[PDB]
Swiss-Prot record, chain A:
This is Twist-related protein 1. It is linked to Saethre-Chotzen syndrome: A craniosynostosis syndrome characterized by coronal synostosis, brachycephaly, low frontal hairline, facial asymmetry, hypertelorism, broad halluces, and clinodactyly. Efficient DNA binding requires dimerization with another bHLH protein. Homodimer or heterodimer with E proteins such as TCF3. ID1 binds preferentially to TCF3 but does not interact efficiently with TWIST1 so ID1 levels control the amount of TCF3 available to dimerize with TWIST1 and thus determine the type of dimer formed. The gene is TWIST1. Acts as a transcriptional regulator. Inhibits myogenesis by sequestrating E proteins, inhibiting trans-activation by MEF2, and inhibiting DNA-binding by MYOD1 through physical interaction. This interaction probably involves the basic domains of both proteins. Also represses expression of pro-inflammatory cytokines such as TNFA and IL1B. Regulates cranial suture patterning and fusion. Activates transcription as a heterodimer with E proteins. Regulates gene expression differentially, depending on dimer composition. It comes from Homo sapiens (Human). Subset of mesodermal cells. It is found in: Nucleus.
Swiss-Prot record, chain B:
Residues 16-125 form the Bromo domain. The chain holds residues 333 to 460 of 1362 of the full protein. The gene is BRD4. This is Bromodomain-containing protein 4. Transmembrane segments: none annotated. Changing residue 98 to C: In CDLS6; likely pathogenic; reduced acetylated histone binding.
Length: 12, 128
């Protein structure tokens, strides 16, 4: 586990 | 030589080159900021939304999250000496992005689009 991989943003 | 056409003269007063870099640097960020790149630079204008994105691990990952708006604001602050102050922070927001994000990610998706445009834009930056 280096980084959560955001799970952020969906462009909209 | 030490890099082809890398440097040749220190700037007089302040710029002639440098703040000229920022007029460019800015139009560049402001371009990622463009409604054109606002499909994907918009999460860069502003800071990685650790709430919205449901990050949590963010502050572990991220040490220096850059946002197109500060770097710009600093442009708008002339805090950036030049466009390389500028893109130093573009590279910062880009960095903290793929830093946190896998390349199969949305943020990186967005990140790499800016990576394309910013770097293309930045390729049009002086240094003389």
């Amino acid at each position: 586990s280096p980084a959560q991989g955001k799970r952020g943003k969906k462009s909209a | 030589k030490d890099v082809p056409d890398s440097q040749q003269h220190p700037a007089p007063e302040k710029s002639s080159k440098v703040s000229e870099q920022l007029k460019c640097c800015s139009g560049i960020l402001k371009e990622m900021f463009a409604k054109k790149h606002a499909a994907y630079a918009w999460p860069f204008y502003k800071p990685v939304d650790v709430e919205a994105l449901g990050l949590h691990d963010y502050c572990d990952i991220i040490k220096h999250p850059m946002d197109m708006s500060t770097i710009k604001s600093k442009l708008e602050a002339r805090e950036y000496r030049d466009a390389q102050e500028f893109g130093a922070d573009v590279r910062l927001m880009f960095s903290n992005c793929y830093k946190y994000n896998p390349p199969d990610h949305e943020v990186v998706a967005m990140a790499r689009k800016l990576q394309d445009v910013f770097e293309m834009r930045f390729a049009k930056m002086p240094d003389e």
